């Protein structure tokens, strides 16, 4: 059955994403904080998509890495074609949802990835940071608080739920996220922040000695 | 079932790589020492990809031969396109993992090859040798000490682990590697080194009289 084939494809994607590390992105005082357990240093599941837009993913690495590359190309095309400020995370997430639904329908193999799009207020401007969660089939979800992706999302999601606090300070939100994700060491983790206080490029990583001191 | 099709494909690649000859590459005092047993003089399992980047593989010779070739054109194109120093083993391993996933996914016949990507510090520069092992489906792993290609990887891997010494001299590293690999003669072997002390091209081979005197 075509319905049977689609259900098999969906369960393939869910089980692929299930046997994956957990990535969390939360809105805190300084914007959006990216946390992902990434033991490999060369591999990076967190990246920047635009000046005030970051990239988070949970799934097969080359899949969402190719998706990230294509999205960066599209965002650069959009910025150069029209204006730097004409690039928004909403349109990026819309393009990604289009592409994921397309591929999932047409590709013999679905992608077992989960993609989160984070956008923050421009520098010298106030706006609540936006979190867009996109499913493998294009099901986009707008999260006002936090996005949990990969692995057992239920325990960490609940722990963040009671542990959620808006405009949380950097270190406090960090330790809250560490406690929720535990449900680790300074290494084996990936940390980045979308900082609205940045004049142009909000994205920034916090690793190593800085990451140690923040813990 | 698509699941059973993927299972038989992956097990086919597994049988190919297991039923294949063994290659070991280790980080030692002089950089990376490449050890692959090779009775055939014409057929080569070790090669240079870049000035400080070599090539290692385990599987069907034509498969990784064409893959090594394509990677060589890609690396030369990147070096000429931007700069020679802008080419890194990380990006090469990323491209290899992506194209291996592509071949596994759409190409009806999987490659029964499993590759190792090595990069050393530039001359007059300190940086630990980097080892990237990629398998048929693109599952890349970063090994800081040693990478074993194909064959009965378990006894040889355990012997290496017990006898691996960081910054081992080339003689000691060679004798450790051959003792682990026995678990052959001067013939039926291929020895190559990515020597950081090389000004530009770290790669170099040691065979015959040099290999004999070294043994």
């Amino acid at each position: 059955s075509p319905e049977q084939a689609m259900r098999e494809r969906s369960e393939l994607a869910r089980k692929g994403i299930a046997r994956a590390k957990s990535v969390v992105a939360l809105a805190y005082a300084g914007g959006v904080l990216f946390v992902a357990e990434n033991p490999s240093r060369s591999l990076q599941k967190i990246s920047e998509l635009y000046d005030r837009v970051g990239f988070a993913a949970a799934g097969k690495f080359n899949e969402f890495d190719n998706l990230r590359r294509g999205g960066i190309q599209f965002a650069d095309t959009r910025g150069y074609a029209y204006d730097r400020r004409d690039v928004t995370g909403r349109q990026l997430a819309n393009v990604y949802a289009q592409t994921l639904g397309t591929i999932f329908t047409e590709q013999a193999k679905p992608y077992e990835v989960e993609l989160c799009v984070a956008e923050v207020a421009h520098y010298g401007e106030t706006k609540r940071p936006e979190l867009y969660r996109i499913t493998y089939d294009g099901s986009i979800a707008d999260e006002p608080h936090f996005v949990v992706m990969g692995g057992t999302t239920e325990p960490i999601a609940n722990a963040l739920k009671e542990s959620y606090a808006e405009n949380a300070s950097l270190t406090d939100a960090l330790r809250i996220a560490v406690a929720a994700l535990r449900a680790l060491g300074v290494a084996s983790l990936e940390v980045a922040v979308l900082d609205a206080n940045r004049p142009r490029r909000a994205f920034r990583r916090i690793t190593g000695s800085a990451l140690q001191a923040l813990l | 079932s698509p699941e059973q099709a993927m299972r038989e494909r992956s097990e086919l690649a597994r049988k190919g790589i297991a039923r294949a000859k063994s290659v070991v590459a280790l980080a030692y005092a002089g950089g990376v020492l490449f050890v692959a047993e090779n009775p055939s003089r014409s057929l080569q399992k070790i090669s240079e990809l870049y000035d400080r980047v070599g090539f290692a593989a385990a599987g069907k010779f034509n498969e990784f031969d064409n893959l090594r070739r394509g990677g060589i054109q890609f690396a030369d194109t990147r070096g000429y396109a931007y700069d020679r120093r802008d080419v890194t083993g990380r990006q090469l391993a990323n491209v290899y993992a992506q194209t291996l996933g592509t071949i596994f996914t759409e190409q009806a016949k999987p490659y029964e090859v499993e590759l190792c990507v090595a990069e050393v510090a530039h001359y007059g520069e300190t940086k630990r040798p980097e080892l990237y092992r990629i398998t048929y489906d693109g599952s890349i792993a970063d090994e800081p000490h040693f990478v074993v290609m194909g064959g009965t990887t378990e006894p040889i891997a355990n012997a290496l682990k017990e006898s691996y010494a960081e910054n081992a001299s080339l003689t000691d590293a060679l004798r450790i590697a051959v003792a682990a690999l026995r678990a052959l003669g001067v013939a039926s072997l291929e020895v190559a080194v990515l020597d950081a002390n090389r000004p530009r091209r770290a790669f170099r081979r040691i065979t015959g009289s040099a290999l004999q005197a070294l043994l």
């Binding site: 692929g16 994403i17 590390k21 990434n38 591999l43 097969k60 080359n62 077992e112 990969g150 | 890349i140």
Partner: peptide, 4 residues
């Protein structure tokens, strides 16, 4: 598949 690589998921980490």
């Amino acid at each position: 598949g690589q998921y980490l």
